[model samples]
Target: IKQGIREVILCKDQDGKIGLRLKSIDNGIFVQLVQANSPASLVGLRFGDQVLQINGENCAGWSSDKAHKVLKQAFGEKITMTIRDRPFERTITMHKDSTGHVGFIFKNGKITSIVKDSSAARNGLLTEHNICEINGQNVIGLKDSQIADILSTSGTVVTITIMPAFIFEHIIKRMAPSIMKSLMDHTIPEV
Candidate 1:
């Protein structure tokens, strides 16, 4: 994704659901989930997109509860969002051993651990990074099993792009003061 402001205009669904999910982590609001074939996805809203403004109001320090309240109570069907591209991505290439698996432990799009004495460690795989791309496709909205399967079936020569968690948190700390409520807020049930 390019670096810049992306504005998405969304039309709410009949049931008042926009197929969008949001969360606040460390005082920063981000797109926690996005449903396919829905308004949010249709307009290209994606996971980890840092929400700057909702309906042109600067929501830089917005709590998850406040963001949802705005979305749920919003009048009419128009919702405009200003979002920044997902952060801090770096690409790395590593060869999988005979096991047909990358030498790192990842789940639900996040890298949990990197195995020592392996290509993942040697290739500078960092712990706690979000898996952005494998080969060429993205895995942001994919489930843990689905992501695991991608790693399982991928060939030996695997190139991956990951967004480190630190970068987002780093940016968050530099933003406005936190009226901080919860670290992670989940308004919608995971599928």
Candidate 2:
């Protein structure tokens, strides 16, 4: 593969599997792993490589299924690829209680879910907060394992900084008219 902008041509196995695992990200699909001795590995494909294009088609912002379709269609034949390094970063620090639970499920640098009555939920951390750091550490351009390691090992009372994802705001805005009508119908006049 070429440096910086890599171009790797690979052929999928008979079962339409290319020996590469992918994860969908906000910007594109990232290579999660390349099985050893597989065509992908033999061609020098590495983890965390962003698949920018497949067979001259732009794959940016494509879902994992879409990327899979592209690869599957090219099974048993050479498929051209254009790749770059995945360069997204977000982090958050959270204090763990005595139970060693942060009370949030993290994925792709965003808080995917939060447990009710948990430290994160009770502390006003939103469901979709974009994490950027943990305990004064810069998590920019880091791996999932690296981030998880820090989060899992952080002692009680960790510090986290995050940017609100505002996902709920969008939801509320979409239903604002109906919500306002419901509220007006249910409200009682002030005494």
Candidate 3:
């Protein structure tokens, strides 16, 4: 294995524990924890890294139990694992000013929960808005730390641009067949 890569080869302890915990989600094994003072921790197997392969074996459809077996069997020998860190896909911008608290919990650069009677709730910010920009600055693909830094500099009055989830779903639900038919009449028929 090449150094500097996030991949690691962790040997199991005598007790058969690799100091790691994994959860099977869909087609991948998610790294839940890398225990302190454990071999995995030393190897930099971080939490939220999705185990994609183990010892050159494809782990796409493998369950956590199956993956654990590989590690358990390689008690003395080193087991190679390929992992990718999962990114936060859902993020929302929140503002806290002299007026009061922003009333939301920002985690991983996203709004995980909102406080009751807060400005966020009052402003009709939904849990589905994926924040793409803050204070007119593009924040796409930025890490949580980077995003937090930007937010700190954004001042008390912050404005955010977002991609609303179900942008078409809401429109389709609210639209009527009569309105669609009238709009369709304006278009020429395909040849």
Candidate 4:
């Protein structure tokens, strides 16, 4: 396990559910979706937490299907896991300006530009931070043009969870998109 590994024991609810979903990405598995108010979420099991071990069994090459079995197999017992730390995530608070914008431009849900002297720059929003949600509506899966519509149509004081875009690419081993390697993290006067 990695040095940042954290041990947690999730208790199964009366319905016999642990409430955390795991997704396998190649050789490693990670916490993909977490059920809110469930034992897993209540215990602080965040999304993207790397599943290192389950019940002392090293998940060397296990998939979500296999891991799912392990959790429910020991039905009446507590499911213990060693989850490695992934990354620090949080929201960005920036009020809207008269220009009717958050003062940023994004591509593929990733912020590529930040307008200076505007709400975005004032709140210290970097261009590399990826957009997760706008006014609590997820923009990660939205098309760039669709996202533009949402942005322009949203209200003032738009609080959003701009995901911290650092690390995990190497470990996750996902193919890097061409735009990901491009020079987009540049300051601009307007969005």
Evaluate model 4: give its lDDT.
0.65
Per residue, candidate 2 scores C-alpha lDDT tens digits across 93-125 of 556877788888877556788898888887767
Each model's lDDT comes to 0.70, 0.61, 0.56, 0.65
Residue 53 C-alpha lDDT in model 4: 89
| Candidate no. 1 TM-score | 0.64
Residue pairs of candidate 3 with colliding backbone atoms:
none
lDDT of 3 by residue, 48-122 (tens): 457777887877887677877776676457788887754322234556756545666554434566678776776
Question: Against the hidden true structure, what lDDT does model 3 obtain?
Answer: 0.56
- Per-candidate total of colliding backbone pairs: 0, 6, 0, 0
Q: Which candidate's lDDT is highest?
A: 1
List the candidates' TM-scores in order: 0.64, 0.44, 0.47, 0.56
Clash pairs detected, candidate 2: 90-131, 91-131, 91-132, 91-133, 92-132, 93-160
Question: What are the runs in model 1 whose C-alpha is more than 4 Å off?
Answer: 88-101, 106-119, 130-146, 155-191
User: Which predicted model would earn the best TM-score?
Assistant: 1
RMSD (Cα, Å) of candidate 2?
16.1
Model 4: residues >4 Å from true position, as ranges? Answer: 1-3, 87-112, 117-129, 132-191
The C-alpha RMSD in Å for every predicted model, in order, reads 7.5, 16.1, 18.3, 9.7
